[PDB]
Symmetry: D2
Subunit: 213 residues, 4 copies
């Protein structure tokens, strides 16, 4: 059902989800059983007064493809579960549009060309080492930080909201902002009430109030 492309070869794909906004309502009340307006008011109430633990009973699993340098920033979120690929070889090459804004001394397209060339040289050294009998765990160290990896991320909505706080923000690196908007979108579609209360009361960042879904 839900897969969003990010960057040149990335994605965020939704694998599974447990619960919805009413999961947090039931957990707060500690009752397994509905009144829309009242249950909506509770979500807002929880979020307004920082009673956030009921949001932990909503869990998501994502399959994410992102460059290693993005993954490293992501994996710093410790309240979450991860399984990473331990195979195929693709790389994020920034478009020229990624480098307009910045005043530079060579054309933005030349930057894209240069990055692409160095990637090609590195990969080729790697394949050459692999063909020589060099084990992969050694041969791969020449590969650049823009090598795509993939991982499964299982994460509850509370910790997901910490992630949005930190990464759906103009101080975060643009690349990771893009992934974060994809995660915000899937989150909004599954837990609309919780996302809305979040934006309203607890969200510390800037982009999700700018840019729809």
């Amino acid at each position: 059902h839900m897969k969003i492309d990010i960057l040149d070869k990335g994605f965020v794909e939704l694998v599974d989800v447990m619960g919805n906004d009413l999961s947090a309502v039931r957990a707060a009340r500690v009752s397994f059983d509905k009144d829309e307006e009242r249950d909506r008011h509770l979500i807002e109430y929880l979020m307004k007064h920082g009673h956030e633990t009921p949001f932990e009973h909503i869990v998501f699993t994502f399959h994410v493809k992102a460059p290693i340098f993005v993954a490293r920033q992501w994996f710093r979120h410790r309240i979450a579960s991860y399984n990473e690929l331990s195979l195929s070889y693709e790389f994020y090459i920034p478009s020229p549009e990624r480098l307009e804004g910045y005043k530079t001394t060579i054309p933005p397209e030349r930057v894209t060309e240069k990055i692409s060339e160095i990637v090609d040289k590195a990969y080729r050294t790697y394949l050459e080492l692999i063909e020589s009998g060099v084990p992969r765990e050694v041969a791969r160290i020449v590969l650049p930080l823009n090598l795509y990896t993939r991982f499964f991320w299982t994460v509850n909505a509370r910790s997901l909201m910490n992630f949005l706080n930190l990464k759906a923000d103009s101080h975060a690196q643009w690349e990771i902002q893009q992934y974060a908007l994809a995660i915000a979108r899937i989150f909004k579609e599954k837990c609309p009430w919780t996302f809305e209360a979040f934006l309203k009361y607890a969200y510390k960042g800037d982009i999700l109030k700018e840019v729809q879904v």
Copy 2:
């Protein structure tokens, strides 16, 4: 739609589950995209080599009604999520765990087992009544209720991934735990086996550290 009664008025109820044995398999392979023997071999392989992180992608929510002493041993499992009943969003009720006389069997007591049951009962009744008398007096509940005993039943939601569930089972599905938390762990075990049989079967065979799940 799965509930097990525990002790005289307790229960463990399955509220929700995300995934099944195949969720760990997809995690280990990092593939969203069938061969059944193949998939089991992998579950067994993961278990026996201690690669437990794929099992974190299976998750349960349980609703447990337990006496406070039990809940305190339970809440010590930090890698999980909890919400306890508070009289702030929901109705509170007052029930207490009274051991059956069978519970003292094995122990050579000076007092008959039924008399132990009755003494526990008497104390519950007297504490509960002192409590009520205090509320009626205008003592706030937060103060009044400090006289209630440890066998007062509480309720909570517990959301826990399989890896941490297995840890719980290693520690509480064991003869070394208090008998009351064992019965709760047996119920956990049973719900877990129902929803992830391949995993549970591999857990017993390879990773389970306790004793009682291999007799019941």
Copy 3:
């Protein structure tokens, strides 16, 4: 040499057993370096606190020894990003209980005089204890007997907590909406944290602290 003890309630306490690092520990983590002028290091602590960059404060760690009634302990133990070891089989067990003083019931217009409330609590507590002792005398195992004991029975535990998690604790428990009893314990924890990490603590009150009682 690190060591402080603050008495809380009638028989409770919070004791500092050890501390790793100081304000400069956070400064060093944030820079990934070995610094020890104060002007700049202080600016940086504020900077970090302001912008919600809290990870460096995780590199300051405290160990506490806490004697608190079980009801206070249950709330405390909900803080999962911390390490706990509660008293057991390695030490002698003692039996003391939190009796509130009449003044605790001030402002509450009560049907019986506050001294009577205090006296009622002692009675029912004493009764529960004496029943406990008689069950123990009769051969009832302690894990069964003890379930009659009330929520004001004092326990002891060690708590090892880092400064970021400590600050979260103070945000939740040093607040007029927490139960008074725990507010008192939070005030002792705030006191010890101020003493040992003055810059962080002061930055915390100005930029991040969410409660009301510490700013009095």
Copy 4:
């Protein structure tokens, strides 16, 4: 500060430590004779009562290739502060495996060629990086061309229980040789600060292989 050099440019260094074997013994006893206290450590470890070891805490300063750092940061029950790829100044150094690293494989070019080929490619990527910086390209973008052998630095605060889990998984022959080396350095510092706990860990709860044959 104890400091142990690992690989060509790396290290583990001890920034601070809280407590020692007795910190666990005090935690276990819940209270503020050497044979009795050593014997308690053994007992705890033997019967699975590991929570008292959470009250011994370390902070390390580690300089490691990014590929080692990445395997390391999967240990979530710890606190980490790293140089910023976007902002921090770096030493731009790189791990060049010795030729001896390849001995044990049959390869079709000599191990020294392999070492040299790794150097060349590292060299071209670094120079390309410098031309991009030189050109006005911000570092958060220009750095994506650097290889995974680039050395980074991080602070690591971790309690002894979590540290023992790390040693179970990294001071082990199935782990990549490079992280083994770092694990041995961490095992050395641990052993020095907490001799009783360390001996007990080897004897009752250590699941790896190498710390039992490598002092």
